[PDB]
Design a protein around this ligand. Sequence first.
Ligand SMILES: C[C@H]1O[C@@H](n2cnc3c(N)ncnc32)C[C@@H]1OP(=O)(O)OP(=O)(O)OP(=O)(O)O
Ligand SMILES: C[C@H]1O[C@@H](n2cnc3c(N)ncnc32)C[C@@H]1OP(=O)(O)OP(=O)(O)OP(=O)(O)O
Ligand SMILES: [Cl-]
Ligand SMILES: [Cl-]
Ligand SMILES: [Mn+2]
Ligand SMILES: [Mn+2]
Lengths: 163, 166
Amino acid sequence: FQGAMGSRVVILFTDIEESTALNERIGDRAWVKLISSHDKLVSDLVRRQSGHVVKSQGDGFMVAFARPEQAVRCGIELQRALRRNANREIRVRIGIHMGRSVRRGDDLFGRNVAMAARVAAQAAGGEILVSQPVRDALGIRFDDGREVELKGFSGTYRLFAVL
Amino acid sequence: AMGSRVVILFTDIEESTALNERIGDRAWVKLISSHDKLVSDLVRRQSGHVVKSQGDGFMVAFARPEQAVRCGIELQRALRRNANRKRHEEIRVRIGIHMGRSVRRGDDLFGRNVAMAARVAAQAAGGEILVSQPVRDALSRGIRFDDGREVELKGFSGTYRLFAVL
Ligand SMILES: C[C@H]1O[C@@H](n2cnc3c(N)ncnc32)C[C@@H]1OP(=O)(O)OP(=O)(O)OP(=O)(O)O
Ligand SMILES: C[C@H]1O[C@@H](n2cnc3c(N)ncnc32)C[C@@H]1OP(=O)(O)OP(=O)(O)OP(=O)(O)O
Ligand SMILES: [Cl-]
Ligand SMILES: [Cl-]
Ligand SMILES: [Mn+2]
Ligand SMILES: [Mn+2]
């Protein structure tokens, strides 16, 4: 479609809950070790689901996938790993959305990138939220969804938690 | 706090999502590409280094607080002058500046002072440059500041006095 800027991509954001407080409690040396380990785990899981880490945001990542099932499986695997590690507790919120986005270098721009970020911002620590398009596109179980408004967007959006 | 002393500046466009929605992706990408070019130019003029882009804003490192503050002043000026001439859609940008030790890892920066700089920027109004007390105090010797405001910052136990550039 000529009027369409940008190509379809699934965008996933992760974000550690209360990372600043954690950093203050454990100190910078321990924080650097922690985020280094976390980066490696996330990187490895993304690679397993054929995604690409676009960038780090300090205590989380922006990630691109071709298919929604890849992004959701990556999220499920990360949450499972964070739970496993805590029984030796970093909590992460994950949001997933899909739509056209504009590529510039390795980065992605446009309203669907913003949407993915707000879906993630809506998620509780330990939760994976996905937008309706992702839910509709998808051995994965979802809740019945919840209506929310997102910062910068008009109207309401139904977001679905992975169960 | 660990690592080498550095000044950290964050920029962030106010309500960029609403703007993107209003003008559409074609216009947004043109705007953000032009904004990136402007910021990159001003950063280079003050010997700074852009660490990363965060969509509608940048994380920038400087050796000296005067460089970071001069950069913020030049940016706010350019943005106001550009908006006044309809050079691009009006954008208002928040700017926060903090200094202290942070850990280098690759080309990124980590630690509580990075988080502090991000929170200082988050407190700034669109069109404002807010700096932490160490930055204000470091410039005590043609840059003027207000009398500061005391604020709580998420994730920090303290109360912190933040100063706007006048
Ligand atoms: C205070 C903000 O600092 C961000 N931050 C830390 N290091 C970096 C970095 N190297 N690059 C970019 N950003 C960085 C992450 C942190 O933002 P939040 O995730 O909003 O803070 P926090 O995790 O404390 O609170 P919540 O996520 O629970 O809201
Ligand atoms: C909704 C979130 O999407 C962020 N965003 C958009 N594109 C990118 C990108 N390529 N890389 C990283 N982040 C991106 C910016 C936006 O976050 P905010 O700046 O908090 O949104 P907004 O400008 O609407 O809110 P305020 O700055 O007014 O709080
Ligand atoms: Cl939101
Ligand atoms: Cl003017
Ligand atoms: Mn966080
Ligand atoms: Mn913004």
